[PDB]
Design a protein around this ligand. Sequence first.
Ligand code: SAH
Lengths: 244, 8
Amino acid sequence: HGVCWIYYPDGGSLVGEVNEDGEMTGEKIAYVYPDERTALYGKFIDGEMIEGKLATLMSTEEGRPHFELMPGNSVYHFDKSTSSCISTNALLPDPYESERVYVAESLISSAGEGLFSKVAVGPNTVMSFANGVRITHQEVDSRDWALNGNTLSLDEETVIDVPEPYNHVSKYCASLGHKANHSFTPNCIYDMFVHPRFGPIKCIRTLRAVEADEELTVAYGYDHSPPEAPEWYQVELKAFQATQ
Amino acid sequence: SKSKDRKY
Ligand SMILES: Nc1ncnc2c1ncn2[C@@H]1O[C@H](CSCC[C@H](N)C(=O)O)[C@@H](O)[C@H]1O
């Protein structure tokens, strides 16, 4: 019997012995994060995580991953958000993200909290996940900017939001990508990400090497000439325009 | 749109 690895464009993968139909179904299937080391291992059905236990990929032998289960009883399952439910376990952090980022006061003035790197990493490193409730562009675009501080476009049908009071880490910390502040000279970008718990979402990926405790920033990418944007950004866009 | 990262 053979093992197969199926990679997503983001560098995450599913791995295991596939069944007769080449499906990722069994009791020893794993999702492996883009670090090629952190894994969620256990029961999957056609690649959907039913019960993934936190594990570390320790080696591969003839293509077969050898895992060690982490202590504790951290278990995860596919739990895609809906329009009204952000997560079944809002306070259960993502184990990959928790080793890479933490939330603290931004270094940007008057910008509240921000997202920071816990350790030094190279370019192109996935740091954090942007999960939220899934609502339409009509709802978002038809309402005041004060309700839209955390809205992120996912594709042409869906916007991801972290509505109050889930924007406080004491109410929701399963993902932290909504905590990244904006910069016109960012060190990170948004990228598509297929997550085994959150489903198809976006991630924050570094553009360049970043140091430990460096603040992570992304360009929010508001339309500058439809600027359809909140005030702090319109202001900031003029400073940016000046420096050029 | 009043959301981040839309592709215009
Ligand atoms: N460059 C910047 N300048 C000022 N405020 C910013 C900013 N980038 C982000 N923000 C703030 O952060 C919000 C987007 S969500 C970002 C996390 C937020 N700072 C928090 O504490 O939860 C915006 O509504 C704005 O209040």
